[PDB]
Amino acid sequence: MLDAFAKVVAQADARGEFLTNAQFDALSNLVKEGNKRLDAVNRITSNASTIVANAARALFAEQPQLIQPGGNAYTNRRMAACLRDMEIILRYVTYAILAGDSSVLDDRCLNGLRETYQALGTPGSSVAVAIQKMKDAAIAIANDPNGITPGDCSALMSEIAGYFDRAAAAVA
Amino acid sequence: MLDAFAKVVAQADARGEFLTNAQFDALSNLVKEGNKRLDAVNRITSNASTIVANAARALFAEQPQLIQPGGNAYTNRRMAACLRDMEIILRYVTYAILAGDSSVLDDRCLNGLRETYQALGTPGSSVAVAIQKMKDAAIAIANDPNGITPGDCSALMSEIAGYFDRAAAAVA
Amino acid sequence: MLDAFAKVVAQADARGEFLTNAQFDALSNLVKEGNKRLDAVNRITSNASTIVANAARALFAEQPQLIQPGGNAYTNRRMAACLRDMEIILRYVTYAILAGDSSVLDDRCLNGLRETYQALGTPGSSVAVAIQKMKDAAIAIANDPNGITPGDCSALMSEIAGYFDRAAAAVA
Amino acid sequence: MLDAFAKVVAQADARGEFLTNAQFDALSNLVKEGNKRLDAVNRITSNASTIVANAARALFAEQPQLIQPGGNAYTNRRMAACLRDMEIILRYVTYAILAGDSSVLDDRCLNGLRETYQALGTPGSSVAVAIQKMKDAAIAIANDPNGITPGDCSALMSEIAGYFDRAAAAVA
Amino acid sequence: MLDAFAKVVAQADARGEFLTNAQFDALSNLVKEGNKRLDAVNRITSNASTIVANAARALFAEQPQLIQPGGNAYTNRRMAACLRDMEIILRYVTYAILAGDSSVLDDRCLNGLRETYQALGTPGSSVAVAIQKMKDAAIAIANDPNGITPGDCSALMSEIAGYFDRAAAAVA
Amino acid sequence: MLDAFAKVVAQADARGEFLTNAQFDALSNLVKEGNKRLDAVNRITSNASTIVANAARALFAEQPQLIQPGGNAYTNRRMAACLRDMEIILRYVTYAILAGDSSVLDDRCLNGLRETYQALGTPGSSVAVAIQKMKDAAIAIANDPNGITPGDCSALMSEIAGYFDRAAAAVA
Amino acid sequence: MKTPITEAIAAADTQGRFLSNTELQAVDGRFKRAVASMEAARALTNNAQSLIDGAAQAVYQKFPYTTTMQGSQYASTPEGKAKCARDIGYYLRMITYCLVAGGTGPMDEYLIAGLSEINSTFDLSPSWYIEALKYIKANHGLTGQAAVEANAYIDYAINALS
Amino acid sequence: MKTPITEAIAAADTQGRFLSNTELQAVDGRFKRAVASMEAARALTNNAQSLIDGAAQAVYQKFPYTTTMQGSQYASTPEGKAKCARDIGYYLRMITYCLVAGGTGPMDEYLIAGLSEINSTFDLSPSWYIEALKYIKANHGLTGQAAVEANAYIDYAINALS
Amino acid sequence: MKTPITEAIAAADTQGRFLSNTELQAVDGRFKRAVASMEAARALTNNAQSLIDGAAQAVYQKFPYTTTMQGSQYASTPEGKAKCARDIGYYLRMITYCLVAGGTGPMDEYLIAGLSEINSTFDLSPSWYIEALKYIKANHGLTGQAAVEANAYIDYAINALS
Amino acid sequence: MKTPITEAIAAADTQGRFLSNTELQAVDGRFKRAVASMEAARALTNNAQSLIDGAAQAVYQKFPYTTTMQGSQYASTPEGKAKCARDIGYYLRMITYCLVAGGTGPMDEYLIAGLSEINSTFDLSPSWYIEALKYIKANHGLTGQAAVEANAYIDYAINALS
Amino acid sequence: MKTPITEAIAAADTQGRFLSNTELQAVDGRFKRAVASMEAARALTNNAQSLIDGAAQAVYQKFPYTTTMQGSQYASTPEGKAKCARDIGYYLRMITYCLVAGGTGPMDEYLIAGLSEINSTFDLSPSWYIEALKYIKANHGLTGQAAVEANAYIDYAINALS
Amino acid sequence: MKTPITEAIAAADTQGRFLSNTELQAVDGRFKRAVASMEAARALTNNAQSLIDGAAQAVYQKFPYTTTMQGSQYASTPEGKAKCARDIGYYLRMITYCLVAGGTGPMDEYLIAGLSEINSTFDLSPSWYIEALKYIKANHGLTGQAAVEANAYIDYAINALS
Ligand SMILES: *[C@H](C)[C@H]1/C(=C/c2[nH]c(/C=C3N=C(/C=C4\NC(=O)C(CC)=C4C)C(C)=C\3CCC(=O)O)c(CCC(=O)O)c2C)NC(=O)[C@@H]1C
Incomplete structure (x- = not known):
């Protein structure tokens, strides 16, 4: 990479x-700008579980047909798989934030994912909604003014949103 | 399965x-109806070798071009391969009889077989003739009134024919 | 083979x-005609390194864009790969000379090579030029009248050229 | 086996x-006597988790030095390993009960275990105490007169104790 | 080697x-002396099956306890294993004859065989008798004066006996 | 580690x-003391090749019987193996310097090496001499007063000598 | 899916062999045990609603905080209560499938696979479901081998949660 | 050795699991089929000598050259005849073991493994044994499921020879 | 054990190479971050008893049933309370080790490996420890990069429990 | 196909090397032995019909039952006799190919691979073909190294059938 | 490409984990060492032409035959001299890339991989480049940690050539 | 060690087969080529000293700096000159072994394996040895197939150095 x-x-x-x-x-x-970058990675990473869980609950509350018998997220095996994917995407997004380049995301994660979801029967547009929810949660956590040395760290927030949108477009 | x-x-x-x-x-x-089903499986299985051998002899007597120099069944290696395939198909058909469902046949045997024979140059329609001959032999053995408690066991015979026809259509 | x-x-x-x-x-x-054939194989094999090296130098002197920054032969890793390929093709050509049949060349070397070079971005027509240069060097070495029992060994030289042209056409 | x-x-x-x-x-x-044997296997198997857990708690309450910092069962990794071993031994003991022969126990479980524990530094005599506790729990569950057709099923209880003692002696 | x-x-x-x-x-x-050596290898190799079979029959006729229920050669699996070993030893002996050196025999065959037979429970001295019988058959076949250009080819016969005795001593 | x-x-x-x-x-x-430690590792590492080469030349000049026909370092394959070992030992010694602990040396390098050399027939005491020569070269390079911020960095030099002596004793 | 039949077939197919008497006896055992299994399945299905309603309340009684504590993982809201009753119905339905199939396959595939990950991610306590399953085992009202069949799978679920 | 029980255990041990109801049903099928199997085993054992004597002669009648042709592989000498009767007794004994064990394991382990190599090395014709086995199948005098049991293993041997 | 140094060495040893500048920079980063880490470690160690005592009570307050419900997994007895305070002290001690080592290695090796199996086998709820860890994070009284260091490992533990 | 040349090439290609003197000597051995091989091949080809006719009858004489016994595997009918002569011609033709190729490759590929399966499936006795091959070996009328060449492959076939 | 960052990521991705404090410290070490690295990179870049010109001549002085001996591998012609200066510029450019990237990745990927094969195929002597690199190390005119940085990669190249 | 015989055996042993005619022809090729090989071996052995002395000087003439330049890798001292003559004698001796063995095995095992590592570690230039080998090839005074044999291995060495 x-x-x-x-x-x-x-x-x-x-x-x-x-x-x-x-x-x-x-x-x-x-x-x-390295300090700001490391802060964003540390903060998102530190809240990895809640970001994924809260986004999953929100997705399933808006799209209940995904967990109804038959739905793609029905049964614990499929539910687990879906939670794993959200965590995996979040993981590769943080890698890209640290690297300051999106190649690791495209190469080891996004590339070929759309095809993977179509073969399975997984609704890519719903995955995209989950990704978007994590984005808003990740950014609000990373750019939270509390407990950190004040300063403009907004250009980095646009870079971070870019990666999330990048992943959302690859599955959508 | x-x-x-x-x-x-x-x-x-x-x-x-x-x-x-x-x-x-x-x-x-x-x-x-389980007893009848087990009888049919046991009887066909018990006569596995003769069913395959007799069907092979009949096929080669009707289609001699298959064993003439050049033919697809010429040379012992190709002859052995052809006998193996007939035995394999018969094997998966008995599995389907026991299961009362044809998924194991389609999944581990029939699926992708037609493509396999075309790539090799093996005449699928001739394979279908071999399958048909085993069918008539298997059914006459399974539904033989001698040495068994009398009773109507004909619906099962239609189910069995179905599997054979199913395999014959997948290679034909 | x-x-x-x-x-x-x-x-x-x-x-x-x-x-x-x-x-x-x-x-x-x-x-x-076996003696002549063995002489040609021994002579080409004995001069393997110079044949490849001289052809590589000639290619790069005529097509300098191949070693300029960016070129497909730029960097030692790519240069090494290119030299390896020339040696590999020469190797399989000598096999075909010994066998008196080109199947080993087509089967283990030429088959699928064009597709390989296109996927990589390697200019097949330039590879063909390298092959052609080795051909002229290999033939002049094999058919050198010095130090060997005099005799017509020209039909074999046409057979040898055939293999080289065969490889040059498979990448071109 | x-x-x-x-x-x-x-x-x-x-x-x-x-x-x-x-x-x-x-x-x-x-x-x-097969019915009684199947009842004993089903009953012990059905209470697998409690048998292991209760025996582990009892062992650690009697031998607290096993979970004190440094102890062989200190740290979750070692604790997990110890619980796994108790479950594994119980598993192989039920196999032997079903088979009516102890070879599967000796062959795939007991054989070489003593050497394994010595190399690790695991107190075999403490393992033996854990095994003994499971024995008394397994037998009281298997031979519980409630909810089952009355009858003498005691010879089988001696056979079962035999297997447990057999395992306890192999590690002790 | x-x-x-x-x-x-x-x-x-x-x-x-x-x-x-x-x-x-x-x-x-x-x-x-190469011609004589090649003749001995070709002749023994050409009669490989009979040499092994005749030696096996002779061994079992002299030592019937080897094929009696319980015997080490009882059951077809053990009988097959025993015939395989005789063929394997004969094979490595012919290699040594061709090489004119016994290292290939010691290295890939004899070395560690005695230990192998003891672990199994196979009577090494009986194996040695089988080897000796093959020796006498191999030598009588290799040194048969019929159908070959007359000449003294006896030093080679002593070399051949040496290899057989070498193998017989390694298992005995 | x-x-x-x-x-x-x-x-x-x-x-x-x-x-x-x-x-x-x-x-x-x-x-x-981390700065001094990093300087020692960087300096020894930077002169890896000369340290090994100079020690090898010195060893072979003092012990010429190691490169005489038959010697353990005779033939390029054995010579290469010997140079590889010197480089490997030097490598693991630098790891230990960086870690400030010798476990990585003992664990992945020294442990079982003596047994390895005896099985091969390699003179351990000669290996020890090579190690000692690298020690004196490594320390003179690491503790060279030229081109570095002045200061007492001698306790570290004793620690470094310790590792070398540790390796020399494990093969000797 | 794991059943006495698919296990028979898989075992034969792995050895590339035709089914033998060994495999056919196993299946006959499956057909004969079916009578008691189908008996347990029908009974649980007929009394599904009351077993589920009774099971849910036994959990709320054993763990009173699940009805008062705030948090989406708790049954302290109408939605939480609906989620809990749904989950319990899932467990029961799975058990009738196991009875009908003659094996743990249905439960293994639809419920047990990924079970730990789910209870961990959504902060659902295993002891909650174990209590629901203990209630069902004590109140299904089955006797003889029909009870032995039902209990076998109920306890299989409980152990999976332990 | 392959039996309904060892197959049950192996399958459970491969998944590192405790035996389940799936496995226990299989074993029950084995215990219930035992009645007919033990019936066939005892009967074959009681009439062993006559079945063997009758089977040997049926072979000599079907293949008359086995009694006249010279060669140690033939029953043209007293030893050959003794070897042949011994072999046939081996096949029969194996079949009673399969009946008693509830599976092909005994036959697989003691007779079928290496079978082709032996008949090839010693030049023994498979059609000889097939005829002996056909005689035993036609004259064991068993009926009902006892016959079905005996025939199952007899035919297993025949197919192994085919 | 996972530390910035052992990671540097392992990476070099896997490629069978000598340490490079790439690896040495990493270690320098480790030495420079040590100042804030050692600061957090000492502070947590000095206030260990009060953080543990305060953390235990925060759990009992958040989950009141842990003090009243019967069962050895609960802190409803003197022993349960002793076990709980011991466990919490274990978590805190692990965090000072991670700070001192410069990595998660200590926590990974002594506490996180086998964590799910333990909480499952002994019926210990992860949300109990998460609450104890949240208390420690809110009351360790550290500021600047020392707090960032402590929080990093505290949150690592929390995520491991999630 | 296995020949002295393809073996030379395969060995070189496996080591990814250019052919060496080691390999070229082998091929020269092949070219020099060709004179005797081509001599044996031509002779067998010229006398093919009589060797086949004589070989078939030697089999019928050695095994008289093959002409009288009923069964499609026997030469007791016009078709059986045609099949037998065809098979024998196959063996002979294969041997001329081996002589011409300088190796067992042709026989290995077209006849020996799958040989046991065929004789087993169609109930054809190996001793029948061995006798046909022994007849050919005794009556090909070759001498010197030409006979040594022919015999080498004839015996290779015989051993493959043993 | 090998950098402190890609190494951090690869290590985390191999364990399928999120980046930890262990990895983030390494990167901080990389950012802090950058000041001295960027200092060395700029300086070498600004004085590139003179370092290259001076380095080429030092080689010709150390190995006088490279300017007189006939052969395309020598700098005895205008082309040879152009090739030599180009190669030396390649080495220098690679070193500024390593400084800028914070690791040997650039040099490893663009120059060291395949290095031995090239010098062997084109008959280029490694001692020639080592002398050019020694000249650059002695005359880059850097001090402090900037020199330590430049020297680290220069010596990495030298060792790769040794 | 790689020889026509060990290659024959290895190939047969890998297929677990007995040696065939295919393998025996190869060996015969080896025995017949021996006459010319033994001729070349004896001649090189008899004239060893002069070929070595002449070869050493040809190198010093082609590369004059090897006698004047300072450095232990050069022949600018009595020891260097002794080392050089020893090395050249090693190459020649290896070639007589290859001739005698009928293959490259001796050279592969004693000299070519590890060759690049040695010339790299001790800074010995391959072009030095290539020139020594070219001298030996031009002055061994062999004709016919004896020369073809010697040249084959000489060129094998040269290519190994290229
Ligand atoms: C064609 C490329 C040129 C040519 C060839 C030519 N060669 C020979 C004769 C021989 N060649 C060999 C060489 C080998 N035999 C081997 O087994 C091996 C592998 C180890 C080799 C390399 C031999 C032994 C001979 C025969 C003996 C001899 O030297 O004569 C001939 C003569 C053939 C004949 O006798 O009728 C010819 C014509 N000649 C040319 O002018 C071409 C440039």
């Missing part, structure tokens, strides 16, 4: 050139 | 309902 | 016939 | 003889 | 020396 | 106690 650093290096190598001043400056800024 | 019992259960679960009286009555009858 | 001998046998078996006099005579001639 | 039936057969085969009348009579009696 | 040629080479390498004239002369003689 | 930190934790857990002030103070000091 590639983080935001190896991304620039791989682009430079393909052209056979040393890095330019603009590129060095851009990279130094990512480093200066 | 599913037997005739798990078939009804899986249908009821999909609807989230207890079994109805009609369903209980239908299931009790299968149980009352 | 099949050598030139098993090729005739397999054709005869498919027809269920003993070999004819013409066939026996044809086979005896291959045997009488 | 061997059940009580295959045990007699294997003894007869080793001598190359048909079974004697005494042997046939002995075997018929095992069959006549 | 080592043949008689690699044996001399490995001895010379250990001393770091080129081969001496005596050694070259000794090696040339092995080459001059 | 265990580093110097997990070592104290595991000792405390075995006793079921929180850490004492003395222990906290001892651990804080290891942390304060």
